[PDB]
Design a protein around this ligand. Structure first.
Ligand SMILES: *[C@@H]1O[C@H](CO)[C@@H](O[C@@H]2O[C@H](CO)[C@@H](O[C@@H]3O[C@H](CO)[C@@H](O)[C@H](O)[C@@H]3O)[C@H](O)[C@H]2NC(C)=O)[C@H](O)[C@H]1NC(C)=O
Ligand SMILES: *[C@@H]1O[C@H](CO)[C@@H](O[C@@H]2O[C@H](CO)[C@@H](O)[C@H](O)[C@H]2NC(C)=O)[C@H](O)[C@H]1NC(C)=O
Ligand SMILES: *[C@@H]1O[C@H](CO)[C@@H](O[C@@H]2O[C@H](CO)[C@@H](O)[C@H](O)[C@H]2NC(C)=O)[C@H](O)[C@H]1NC(C)=O
Ligand SMILES: *[C@@H]1O[C@H](CO)[C@@H](O[C@@H]2O[C@H](CO)[C@@H](O)[C@H](O)[C@H]2NC(C)=O)[C@H](O)[C@H]1NC(C)=O
Ligand SMILES: OC[C@@H]1NC[C@H](O)[C@H]1O
Ligand SMILES: [Cl-]
Length: 627
């Protein structure tokens, strides 16, 4: 096909076009992006004296363990303690382990920070060393450090010790341990609370993020981060919804909550750690507020909304508020960031098409109150576009789609027929998730993708050429879900996978990266792709440099020739760079083959005419300079 490129731009490409969607799903927060290595570190939101309260904790030798409702808890937010008892006539090594999130990476090039709170609930004459460390799950000690404690310490006391492994472990089957001498400790009871083990973090942030994962997210060159959900915003009930103020301050004062994907969230990954990450990576937030629906199906009545609307104002004030004019903004200042963060976009709930009967009044009351307080923010509606009819008229809608790779290339013209009437569109969640049009959300056996494929990434890429062409009205777009702990998965496929040890960059991650890193501020119209066809392209240009990005998706099984005509330009560089992602249709990056499919960069001959054969199932970027 001959593709003529217009030199005259039709519109400016929004700076927000490509970004990330985040919620704590598949342990993407606790156990993923958040660097904490201990699972169930503070016994949050568990029933005392049950097996489930001890999840991830194990005795060493004849140790007796119980999670108790502590008569004198470490904090109001953390009512549960680990009661550790050493029986009469004990000897040798007695204590307990934490198995982490299906392992702990033990690396001799890393210094770890271990902490805990302890008290003797009954004063005793005990005198001896408390030892913390890392061991293989055979009990081989790889790191250890200790400090002296006394049974006379009846008040909550923090221990902080660094750990230096003597050797890197050969795998991630390692645990954190706490031990005392069984003979010196015989007959003693110690209460523990608020455990923590950190590796070195992204940008050495206290309470920060896991380095390989954070770096991988930054590598994609995202412009925005949508958070904190997604379903993990909503809760199962009003009482279990995400609440911003429970996520800020000292870890002692964060009660945690039952999230929406089968596990407790520590809320260690809280609003300030989100905002610090955005500052660290140059992303801006698309921040959701809870809007009076929870996933159990309960809507708040119209006459119940006032306190929840005020809590949303509180959340936004923590982010952007003048510290002299509200308590939430003064709190941001007191936690060491008096300067306001950037916030230009707020989403009102998540997927309120599940509650379209109540959203009209929830949308009306939330947006009228929030737009009056924050006249510069653009509010995003989460119902299906224009059904139901909302008041005020939404400036923006969040559109979600999960479909076959084939659907994505067949629907690259999704936005072309939309009216241009001041509404902008956020493609807040999309992914090609299955090859079975009849059972999109079913099993892998029935066509669900365990990981993104070349087929799924190339379908997506064809759909994304539509998003770029239509970026006069499409302002933002994110794949979902972003992150997957392969040892605790609730949803596939995911953009980036990992275990305790290493990261897997999917085919879809490379499509996202190639689209986001190779994007100009000008959209250059070109010959339109066939609507319904497998072959799609989108061209942008950097006004300041003339760098010109030709993005080509071949989402079909046939190679296709493109002849580009740039005759309207004064000059075209005599060479260009080619970046191509291609492979077999069903090929995936997996834990067993994490580099099976990766992009290849080369130099090609260019000018006012050149020909490129786009292989079957390929994403290609050709960069030339034009003036
Ligand atoms: C984070 O902030 C929210 C408010 O934005 C806090 O929720 C509020 O907590 C108070 C005190 O528990 C609630 O008032 C109580 O309501 C019950 C039921 O009618 C009543 O029995 C009590 O006497 C008291 O009035 C208030 O309703 C609630 N508001 C909302 C909007 O949920 C929340 O506690 C804070 N979280 C943490 C960990 O501090
Ligand atoms: C045991 O942990 C303590 C406390 O973390 C370590 O001592 C610290 O070492 C760091 C790094 O040199 C210093 O910045 C701190 O000032 C030290 N603190 C204290 C209280 O001494 C100690 O190095 C660790 N020992 C082992 C063997 O790992
Ligand atoms: C922007 O254009 C869209 C597309 O015509 C308009 O959407 C219609 O809105 C009415 C209610 O306001 C619905 O009952 C129609 O079904 C919608 N049309 C479609 C095809 O979905 C929208 O109202 C326009 N918005 C503005 C701000 O003018
Ligand atoms: C976490 O998931 C990884 C990846 O699936 C597991 O390691 C794999 O285990 C399978 C089958 O059980 C082996 O055939 C693979 O060779 C392993 N792959 C790799 C890359 O190691 C691991 O066992 C899981 N960990 C836990 C604790 O369940
Ligand atoms: O991305 C996974 C889920 N898809 C719908 C919901 O908004 C998300 O939690
Ligand atoms: Cl398909």
């Amino acid at each position: 096909v001959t593709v003529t490129v217009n030199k005259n731009p039709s519109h400016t490409v929004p700076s927000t076009l490509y970004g990330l969607m985040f919620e704590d799903i598949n342990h993407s927060g606790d156990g993923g992006l958040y660097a904490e290595l201990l699972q169930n570190r503070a016994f949050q939101q568990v029933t005392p004296n049950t097996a489930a309260a001890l999840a991830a904790w194990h005795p060493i030798s004849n140790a007796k363990l119980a999670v108790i409702q502590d008569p004198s808890p470490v904090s109001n937010a953390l009512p549960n303690s680990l009661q550790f008892s050493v029986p009469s006539g004990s000897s040798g090594r007695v204590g307990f382990t934490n198995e982490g999130f299906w392992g702990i990476k033990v690396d001799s090039t890393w210094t770890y920070k271990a902490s805990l709170f302890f008290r003797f609930p009954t004063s005793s004459s005990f005198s001896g060393a408390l030892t913390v460390g890392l061991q293989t799950n055979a009990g081989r000690v790889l790191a250890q450090n200790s400090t002296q404690i006394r049974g006379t310490t009846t008040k909550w006391t923090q221990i902080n010790l660094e750990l230096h492994p003597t050797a890197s472990a050969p795998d991630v089957s390692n645990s954190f341990f706490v031990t005392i001498d069984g003979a010196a400790g015989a007959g003693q009871t110690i209460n523990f609370a608020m455990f923590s083990l950190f590796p070195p973090t992204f940008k050495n942030r206290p309470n920060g993020l896991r380095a390989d994962i954070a770096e991988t997210l930054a590598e994609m060159g995202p412009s925005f981060f949508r958070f904190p959900g997604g379903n993990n915003l909503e809760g199962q009930t009003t009482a279990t919804r995400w609440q911003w103020n429970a996520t800020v301050g000292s870890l002692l004062d964060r009660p945690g909550r039952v999230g929406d994907w089968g596990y407790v969230n520590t809320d260690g990954l809280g609003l300030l750690e989100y905002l610090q990450f955005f500052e660290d990576t140059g992303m801006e937030p698309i921040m959701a507020v809870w809007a009076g629906y929870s996933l159990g199906g309960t809507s708040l009545a119209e006459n119940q909304l006032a306190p929840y609307i005020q809590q949303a104002i509180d959340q936004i004030n923590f982010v952007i508020g003048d510290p002299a004019k509200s308590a939430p903004a003064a709190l941001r200042a007191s936690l060491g960031h008096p300067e306001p963060f950037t916030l230009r976009f707020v989403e009102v709930g998540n997927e309120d098409f599940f509650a379209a009967g109540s959203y009209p009044y929830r949308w009306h009351d939330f947006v009228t109150a929030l737009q009056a307080q924050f006249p510069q923010i653009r509010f995003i509606a989460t119902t299906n576009a224009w059904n139901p009819v909302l008041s005020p008229v939404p400036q923006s809608y969040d559109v979600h789609v999960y479909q076959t790779p084939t659907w994505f290339y067949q629907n690259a013209f999704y936005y072309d027929g939309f009216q241009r009437n001041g509404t902008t569109y956020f493609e807040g969640e999309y992914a090609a998730i299955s090859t079975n049009a009849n059972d999109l959300f079913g099993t892998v056996a029935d066509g669900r993708l365990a990981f993104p494929t070349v087929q799924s990434a190339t379908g997506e890429a064809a759909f994304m050429t539509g998003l770029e062409r239509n970026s006069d009205i499409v302002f933002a777009a994110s794949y979902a879900p972003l992150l997957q702990h392969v040892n605790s998965t609730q949803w596939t496929p995911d953009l980036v996978s990992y275990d305790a040890g290493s990261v897997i960059k999917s085919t879809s991650f490379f499509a996202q990266k190639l689209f986001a890193l190779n994007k100009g501020d000008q959209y250059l119209p070109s010959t339109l792709p066939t609507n319904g066809g497998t072959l799609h392209w989108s061209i942008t240009r950097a006004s300041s440099s003339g760098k010109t990005f030709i993005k080509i998706a071949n989402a079909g099984s046939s190679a296709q020739s493109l002849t580009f005509q740039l005759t309207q330009f004064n000059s075209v560089s005599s060479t260009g760079t080619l970046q191509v992602l291609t492979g077999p249709e069903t090929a995936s990056n997996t834990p067993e083959a994490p580099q099976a499919i990766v992009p290849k960069t080369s130099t090609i001959g260019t000018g006012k005419t050149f020909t490129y054969n786009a292989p079957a199932f390929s994403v290609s970027v050709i960069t030339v300079t034009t003036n």
